[PDB]
Point group: D2
Amino acid sequence: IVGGQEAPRSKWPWQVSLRVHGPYWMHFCGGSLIHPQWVLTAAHCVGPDVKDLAALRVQLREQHLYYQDQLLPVSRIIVHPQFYTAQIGADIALLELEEPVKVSSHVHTVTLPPASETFPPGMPCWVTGWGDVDNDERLPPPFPLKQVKVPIMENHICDAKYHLGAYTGDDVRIVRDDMLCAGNTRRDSCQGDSGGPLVCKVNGTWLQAGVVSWGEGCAQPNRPGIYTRVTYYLDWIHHYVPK
Amino acid sequence: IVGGQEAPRSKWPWQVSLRVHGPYWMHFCGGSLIHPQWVLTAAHCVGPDVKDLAALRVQLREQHLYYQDQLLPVSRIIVHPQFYTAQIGADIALLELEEPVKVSSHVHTVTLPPASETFPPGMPCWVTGWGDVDNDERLPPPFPLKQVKVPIMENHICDAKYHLGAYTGDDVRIVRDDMLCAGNTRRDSCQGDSGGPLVCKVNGTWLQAGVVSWGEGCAQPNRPGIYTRVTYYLDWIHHYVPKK
Amino acid sequence: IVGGQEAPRSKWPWQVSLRVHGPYWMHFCGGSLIHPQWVLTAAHCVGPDVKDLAALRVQLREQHLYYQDQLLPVSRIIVHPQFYTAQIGADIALLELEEPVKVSSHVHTVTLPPASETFPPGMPCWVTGWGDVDNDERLPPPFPLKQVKVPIMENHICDAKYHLGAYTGDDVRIVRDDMLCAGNTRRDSCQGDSGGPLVCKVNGTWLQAGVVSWGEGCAQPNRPGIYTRVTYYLDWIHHYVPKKP
Amino acid sequence: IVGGQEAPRSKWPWQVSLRVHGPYWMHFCGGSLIHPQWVLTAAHCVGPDVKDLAALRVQLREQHLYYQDQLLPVSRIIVHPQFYTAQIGADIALLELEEPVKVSSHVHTVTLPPASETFPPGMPCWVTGWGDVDNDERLPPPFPLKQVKVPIMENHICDAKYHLGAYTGDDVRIVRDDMLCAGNTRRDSCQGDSGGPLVCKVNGTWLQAGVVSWGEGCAQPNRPGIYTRVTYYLDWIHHYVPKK
């Protein structure tokens, strides 16, 4: 997270850390708990190439990475079959846990928006994770969960920004209809925040608008964060995840 | 180049090295001379973001990188307006030199194919450059230009191989119609060969079939090298580059 | 620490972490609390060149590096005036804290040995720190304090081992009289353990025998860990550090 | 070499490059040809731990590293038996070549000074090599042999400089009597120049005053280059190397 602060302990009870087997169980991507037995993440975190399930674990919300680890095994990785790269799109995956989690005030699910929900430009949303604090600048120990308020921006405006200082023809889409855009040169997601949630508070309810997907670096001029648009893939999510 | 040998001095007179300004004028991509004033390369080497022309130079064919440098400034970078990433496609760009080069037996242009040429499997094709000799393994000094004969494979076969060990749906095309596929687990292009030529000898004439574009690593199982198909972009090239 | 275990919370209440200012307050060396206001470390951690005191802080015993940091500023760095390199010797330094710390069962001073104590082979000795777990292999998060029991070896035996597979003449001493030797191919200190304590339990009392100084890599054949011999430098320590009241 | 220039092709015909076996025969240290069959170098380049002779080669003077290599095998490494570290001293070694070299105007031996020779402070001397051009800055391709003029400085003055901004007691020797000192914040030897020669022209003859040994970085304030004093070890050298 670029230009963020440490999250209060009470905030973002749905944030999860994805861990890969090595010298230690290292954080590589974020996720959100959308159901007691399901994590929503980015496809690029776990694909497009098939990964060994034995080398993957989920860690539920912890204030500091690695200090109080209770690693959960994954029974199934479901990557959207249309996914190959984040820039093409369908950058969305589901992790099925071997067990449902026992939910509490400190650990519980995020609400998905209805299909009709159109998060208007300028709406204050929050992105959370344990990713880099700037370009090629890792989160220092003790690795606090960070948060940043980012304004949602119209897809057409974000597409136009990605064309400034680029050879790509103005009529050739960079930011596609299954993508959502947020952030500026002070406030953005970064490497290691991938798969984590963009959440917006609507009528007293936190709704997951986005999954951290891609961008040209972090908080670069005219290069806002690109997110998978959750409303676009609700039918695909609901094919696997109970309502 | 993976599984190659050092090129003989007489071979590949169209091979060029692209150089970026830093502590020294460092090789980052290959290219081909297609006209005395024009270099064909990959868009991903010079884009999609607009870069300072003053920090780019072209080096014509040398047997050993850096030893006999005569660096040429660039007047113009022209990147295909459809290009954003190599995997989406249109991975093709043109460099206009500030001056036309004097051609010779040792330094001269490659011939572009006619639109009808498909380059079927079994055709003898070669890829050349100063790129890595394996995954994360740089070409050692004194940096000889390498060559390797790569077997062309049909786009549908290569598309099917890219789906093996992948979550991507079988009917979601990975290897696109503007791309060409070549190489195996012994013979491939690698990092630093990007933008360089894939050339096939057809009726005694060398034709540039491909621009080194992308792949999953180098010489990996079921992951052959992907090249921009030059025949697909001839009309765009001919918009900028004069006929002989 | 090579071939160690995580230290129990009750052990090594004198272990300190030295921190350098950067993107964060990063661990670079170990140390020992020998007085409420004084830390014993290796000279090579803080010298031979004079460094900015404002860029150095001390962290008292923590079970996991960085998790519960209460960083203490330093008023004075005192490096042995004979020190230039660890291999020449006098690899010993003192940090004066700006304030005396409040001691407890969990955080308190280590006892220095009497001048007469030689620490012979067979004596049970432990080395502790947050250093590498092997050659070029960092301690993983969450960075637990590690301990390992190291066999002390006689200086003459260790000197002879350092000459095996070396061009250095047998009568040219490598392991010097102000140094102490401990460890084997399974048990050793490593990069990041430097300045930390080697402690031996003598008649029910923990005594600091050594300061982690140097070696050829970590846990390598015929290359045991070299430590500054504390007994050699007691008079220099007692020049600066007041005796217990 | 820091603050240097590329050597003219006619200069320093005694300069050699030491090569270690890896992906390629990589330069790690310099040396000087003091006899047709003997190279003088720094002990720290080849010790104190015993190295495999099969993994070591010598390359005689070349203008550009790696481009025209003719690698020579070594029959014997002789490291001074007093050597353990450069800071303690005796940082001097001899390589015996398997064959004597055929000498020419372009490749021939440097003259060693007489025991009586005292190179006075301020004397213009030259250090040569393929080492770093600054702190953590490698010599760029095509790796030209570099030279820099450095004034010799009195051991007592150089010892005093190493004590400025240091905790070391002023009466505790850093720069020892078997060492020689040269260079400033613009002009110095660096990593990769180790074992190479410091040469001074005395009565029309180039004499090797020093072997590149150690220092605190390259061209740092009050930290001039430290060299092994050749006059100190003449008797040891002449124990193995036949006199001219």
